[PDB]
Design a protein around this ligand. Structure first.
Ligand SMILES: *Cc1c(COP(=O)(O)O)cnc(C)c1O
Ligand SMILES: *Cc1c(COP(=O)(O)O)cnc(C)c1O
Lengths: 449, 449
């Protein structure tokens, strides 16, 4: 740092820590007892004094309040969960109803999950629907179903995708590239968990050749249709060709829609690109704020959950029993979660396409205004977008930029996926725009352009 | 079947189906759209007309009502989640509080997880606590932490244990026993996920020899201290030796307390056997009815989550950073879940040891009564027990026996782990005994002894 930059940083740190001193003290006091990876976010030794997560006390609509009483316009929105803002009326009413109703328990099967599955079919075109406890679990199950249905083991995923924390997806590409096995992402992940994993470049044509030439050996291609980390990469022709290749080879095309599902539109990315996957994973929005992961798709693959359907009154039996895999789960189809998922689906189906048109348009406005400002002021920042997911792209110190946004009342978690919600008003969008402009001005004054 | 047995079975199926015809119809009408392995429970082609799960509509205390309006004394209790029965007052109050408080959102870190971790440390003696979304996730993380801390890969589990649905624990012992690699439990689980897994006999003294002769090669021994499947096997000496062995070899002892934790007593199986593991997994009870899985244990192993603890005001830093692994999770430390967990811990800590003494004594009474009845009536059935967990062991057709119990209004899920709760009354226990005795008398009269 130049002296001018050092002087600015020291003054900013003092004001930042004073504003969020309670989050700092809570983090330091609980760090040992409560082990959490997020207590390392953007750690650097020379500014370790402002390296701590923001601790929340309250939320409502587009707003979050921290334990220092600071108010934020929230563009984290529960990592993408809170499409409708915090505590939408129909979610709150669902919880209120559950306190008065002698809610059925875990143990017996759910009396609501059937209608949830029906409405997911109506919204998305999937054939069969299964319920688990996180997006991570849903991805793990989806891979198992593809392998069980096909009798194969090898799976392709794309570099820069995120698919949860199942060890079988936690790899990085081989030194030699191609169809060679992955290496572990981190300590504690054994090489054996990488032997059936292949990581390829997304939207590189030669990846389509590797997959084509791998052919009948691949149990699945697992794709994040729009990768959250690069919202602007929307490779329709790559995805359509991937669909044609895997269909011909009998390989499961698994689309990870844990973010794009129920966000870009009611039918998710499948509907946006008009591509029907074999298996899809859903999560985040679809639980209504409750934890949820879903695997859904074509019977040819989903039959490995129950061995396939059959009827009463005849001699039918599960015809896919020889390919049925092992699945389970204590908290599957939780009674409150199923009622919240039902409330989300009821609301989305009643509100119709205009909900998404208005929300996507509101995000396009935010992205367009900021990109014009960056161009007008010659700032090396750019907004990228897919629907109501958006991100900042910059060569300025990203960590320093986001500390300013958070300081100015715009809450951005460390992973930096940003979302608008149906609860974000015109006033809120203007506030975000102003906070970004003041941040550019401040960093310019500090010598950080 | 003899004609006596055949006619009895035909009559039983007719009355069973008539009593639960709504659950049959709901299962039939939702089977395709809602894919769920539990729909295959106790399938046999010759009695398929009564093959369907019970669909629940209501619950309260020790009771559950199905969608036909039939009332049950529930001894499934959420697969062991519901230590206090359904809707204990302090849990309902937590849900009520959450609807009028503007709960903090997902996104920012939790303002309550510190106290939850502190109380778990006070209850169990663990040093550090981390929160994930299912017991399955907790076990998967715990294995990763042990592998990261030790730099080793191979893990021992014991046959007949259950540790969730992470593919890395879903194996059967090698056809040659001993220290050979496991094989997949089911289709869809690749052999690569088995190569770092070893499956040994539980409580056989030679299993400790095989572990001994493996030396420093094991990242961990994962043990279900009492296996849910065999509650009577409580091998204290075997566990004490297993602790001493792994301690000397620097191998992680991971105790899976997802069932025994907070059930046998406040400190779990660790407190019952007076053994301190390196890592422990909790789940089920500790979420208060919300989904939850926890990995906790000694800093030497838990430090792989955040790199180890540090302080503001000095030059300290994460000192285990080279061994830090990868963990994440959208729904970690969910605001409602953390508050329910806090409510469970506060209630347990206030109520004290007599809560467990009464509940364990109640279960012992039920077990002793039934075993006395079986002995006096010369019936080949026995009860086994660990605390408030109990199971039936019988050479009589188990599925037929349990169809009778369910028909008589005692709810037993297909997995047959049974539980009492603090809500089971004197009337409830007597009705459970009566249902079992009538079941034996009906079966004897039908020719099934
Ligand atoms: C968040 C996410 C996951 C993992 O979901 P969890 O519920 O956090 O396990 C997987 N895939 C994608 C695309 C996601 O955005
Ligand atoms: C239920 C259970 C698990 C898995 O827990 P889920 O929350 O269902 O994933 C793991 N281990 C043991 C001992 C259990 O009883």
């Amino acid at each position: 740092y130049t002296p001018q930059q050092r002087q600015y940083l020291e003054s900013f740190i003092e004001k930042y820590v004073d504003k969020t001193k309670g989050s700092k003290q809570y983090t330091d006091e609980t760090r040992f007892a409560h082990a959490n990876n997020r207590n390392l976010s953007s750690f650097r030794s020379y500014w370790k004094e402002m390296v701590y997560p923001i601790i929340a006390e309250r939320s409502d609509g587009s707003r979050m309040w921290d334990i220092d009483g600071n108010e934020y316009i929230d563009i984290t929105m529960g990592f993408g969960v809170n499409l409708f803002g915090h505590h939408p009326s129909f979610i709150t009413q669902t919880v209120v109803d559950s306190t008065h109703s002698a809610l059925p328990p875990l143990g017996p099967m759910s009396n609501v999950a059937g209608e949830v599955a029906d409405r997911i079919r109506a919204c998305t075109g999937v054939e069969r629907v299964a319920f688990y406890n996180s997006g991570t679990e849903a991805v793990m199950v989806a891979l198992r179903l593809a392998r069980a249905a096909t009798g194969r083991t090898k799976v392709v995923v794309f570099a820069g995708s995120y698919h949860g924390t199942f060890d079988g997806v936690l790899g990085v590409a081989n030194t030699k590239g191609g169809a060679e096995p992955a290496n572990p992402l981190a300590p504690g992940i054994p090489q054996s968990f990488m032997n059936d994993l292949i990581i390829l470049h997304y939207n590189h044509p030669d990846s389509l050749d590797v997959i084509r030439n791998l052919g009948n050996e691949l149990a699945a291609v697992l794709v994040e249709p729009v990768q959250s980390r690069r919202p602007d990469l929307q490779p329709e022709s790559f995805l359509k060709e991937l669909r044609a290749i895997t269909q011909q080879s009998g390989t499961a095309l698994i689309m990870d829609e844990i973010i794009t599902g129920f966000r870009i539109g009611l039918g998710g990315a499948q509907e946006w690109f008009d591509i029907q996957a074999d298996l899809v994973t859903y999560g985040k929005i679809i639980g209504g704020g409750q934890p949820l992961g879903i695997v859904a798709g074509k019977a040819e693959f989903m039959n490995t959950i129950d061995g396939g359907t059959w009827q009463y009154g005849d001699d039918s039996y599960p015809t896919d029993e020889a390919k049925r895999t092992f699945v389970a789960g204590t908290f599957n189809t939780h009674p409150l979660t199923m009622r919240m998922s039902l409330a989300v689906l009821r609301y989305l189906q009643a509100e119709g396409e205009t909900l998404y048109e208005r929300l996507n348009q509101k995000t396009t406005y935010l992205v367009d205004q900021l990109n014009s400002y960056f161009e007008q002021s010659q700032v090396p920042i750019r907004m990228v977008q897919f629907g109501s997911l958006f991100r900042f792209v910059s060569s300025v110190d990203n960590d320093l930029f986001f500390y300013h946004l958070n300081y100015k009342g715009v809450y951005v978690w460390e992973g930096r996926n940003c979302f608008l919600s149906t609860a974000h008003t015109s006033d809120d969008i203007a506030y975000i725009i102003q906070a970004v402009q003041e941040t550019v001005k401040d960093l310019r004054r500090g010598g950080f352009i």
